[PDB]
């Protein structure tokens, strides 16, 4: 179970996510071509680094 660093490309505006959770589109730090969208709580901005544990699922709404 490795730990994948990742960085925010775009915060997403009109997802309809519940409350403090905001969806975000993140591009990996190892293979920077692969990018997925993921749910994020807390204040997040463009171009900052997240740490995620499970990479296999693309996050729903």
């Amino acid at each position: 179970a490795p730990v994948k660093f990742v960085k925010v490309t775009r915060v997403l505006g009109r997802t309809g996510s519940r409350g403090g959770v905001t969806q975000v589109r993140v591009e990996f730090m190892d293979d920077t071509t692969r990018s997925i969208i993921r749910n994020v709580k807390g204040p997040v901005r463009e171009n900052d680094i997240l740490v995620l544990l499970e990479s296999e699922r693309e996050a729903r709404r």
Binding site: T15, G16, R61
Partner: peptide, 17 residues
Amino acid sequence: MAGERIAEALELGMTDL
């Protein structure tokens, strides 16, 4: 729900194809 709407319609069309 707009993106989820067009995504599920894309999947419906893909199974139809």
